[PDB]
Structures are given as structure tokens and as C-alpha cells.
Amino acid sequence: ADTIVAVELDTYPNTDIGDPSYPHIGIDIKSVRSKKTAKWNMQNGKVGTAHIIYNSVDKRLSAVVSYPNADSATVSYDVDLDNVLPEWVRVGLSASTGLYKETNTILSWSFTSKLKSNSTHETNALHFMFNQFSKDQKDLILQGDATTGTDGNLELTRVSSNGSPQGSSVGRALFYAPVHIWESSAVVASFEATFTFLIKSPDSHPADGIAFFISNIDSSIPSGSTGRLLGLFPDAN
Ligand SMILES: [Ca+2]
Ligand SMILES: [Mn+2]
């Protein structure tokens, strides 16, 4: 199976797999059962922003999610990602719906990784920023139902022509180039990610959520990962 580290924006509480009884943000280390969660006052139909940060000295994966005019939600988990992830990874966004549904629209996405080595004022770095997506976005690997270009957005899950989100959908977008998160001469490794999202649902119970994830470079959507598994995991272990 894939190796997955993710920050989940979980819109639907599945209490039998350890979700709290409310929408929440969580840190997932190789399991959909988050190592840490925090309550998330999700807003149907409003544009939100998520930030993810980590560095190899502090070994703490942290995330913050907010909306304009509202307080934020934050979650952190102490973990050495070099003991979890391989040396080369791909980064991406994932989303799903199940019997309950929502739009999982990405309006922008940025990522920065830095490897600071032993040699004088070195730094290896990768940075990308999307503030709009075109219909043929060649530097994204789209998987499942994900599409780009509709209103210049990245639609991670299926939406009808009338704009209604569809259930039982799963889709991901990974940045085309592999990302180097560890090197033998590196003295500090760090990354940060930001994405803005629009989760819209005609229903009182939207599902299932959006995640920023880091994976083995050849990661693909696991079989049966619609719904609560967020397109990231093959089971709820
Ligand atoms: Ca859930
Ligand atoms: Mn959850």
C-alpha cells in the first residue's frame, strides 16, 4: 500500500472510526484514524484557507484552517516525517464524497520545500503556486474524478453541469515533479503548503472532506477510498 501523511479537513463525523462528533481538522499518519484532531467550524459555501507547516528540526506537523471574519482551528502532532515518508515524495490534494456529498473546489494552491545543506549558503528549493487552473494543467497529475479549468478552478470531485456536487466521487491532484524532503547533507528540511477551498453542499450534512497529503511518488487512489477514506487509504485501520 501507499505511505500517506495528510492534513484532513474532515466535514463528516464517522464516529466509529474515531472521528469526533463534529467537522474537524486532523493529522493523519499512515491511517485515516487521525493521531490528533481539533474542532473545525466549517462554513458551507464560504471560501476557506488551510496552511500546513513542518521542519525536520522540530519534527512537528502543524496545520491551521480559517475563514475570513472567523476564528481559526489548528492542530499539531509531533512526528519525525523522515521515519514515515521516503526520501522522495509527491505532494497533492485529495477529496471525496460518499452517500453524502459536497463540492471540493480548490481555488489556489501553493507549496514550498527547502533543503538547507552543509555547504556554504546552499539551499535546494522547490516552489509552485497555482492561483488559477487551466483545462490542460500539464504540471498536475489528475487522478480519479479531478478536473481543472471549470471557472479556472480545480474540482477535486465530480460536479454536474448545473453545479450540483455528486456523491460517491473521489479525485486527487499531485504536483508533477517529485519533491526531495531528505538529503544526507541536509541540516534543516522544511515545507509549507497553502490552499484555498470552496466546500458547497445543498445538504445539512456535507461529506466527506479535503486533504493535503504527502506520499510515495507513485501513489494512486486506493480501491474503495470514496467517502470517509478521503481518497487516501484503502481501509480504516
Ligand atoms: Ca469523516
Ligand atoms: Mn476525521
Author numbering: 1 to 237
Q: Which statements did the authors publish about this structure?
A:
We show here that when long wavelengths are combined with the Mesh&Collect data-collection approach and when a genetic algorithm (GA) is used to compile a data set, a native SAD experiment can yield a structure solution from microcrystals. Furthermore, the GA algorithm can effectively generate a highly complete data set from hundreds of naturally multi-oriented samples collected at long wavelength, thus permitting the compilation of a highly complete data set with high multiplicity, and thus preserving a weak anomalous signal and enabling structure solution by standard SAD phasing procedures. In summary, Mesh&Collect data collection using softer X-rays extends SAD phasing from naturally occurring anomalous scatterers to micrometre-sized crystals.
The data collection (30 grid scans for 298 partial data sets) was completed within 2 h. The autoprocessing routines could index and integrate 180 partial data sets out of the 298 that were collected. The aggregated data set, obtained from the merging of 116 partial data-set wedges, resulted in high overall completeness and decent data quality, which allowed the location of the anomalous scatterers, successful phasing and structure refinement using standard methodology. SHELXD correctly determined the Ca2+ and Mn2+ ions and the S atoms at the Met42 and Met129 sites, producing CCall, CCweak and PATFOM values of 34.2, 21.7 and 55.8, respectively. The anomalous difference Fourier map peak heights were 46σ for Mn2+, 27σ for Ca2+, 7.5σ for the Met129 SD atom and 6.3σ for the Met42 SD atom, as assigned using ANODE. A best weighted mean phase error (wMPE) of 34° and a CC for the partial model of 22% were obtained in SHELXE, with 119 amino acids automatically built. Cullis values calculated starting from the Ca2+ ion or the Mn2+ ion alone were 0.90 and 0.89, respectively, indicating that in the case of proteins of analogous size but lacking cysteines or methionines a Ca2+ ion or the Mn2+ ion alone could provide significant phasing information.
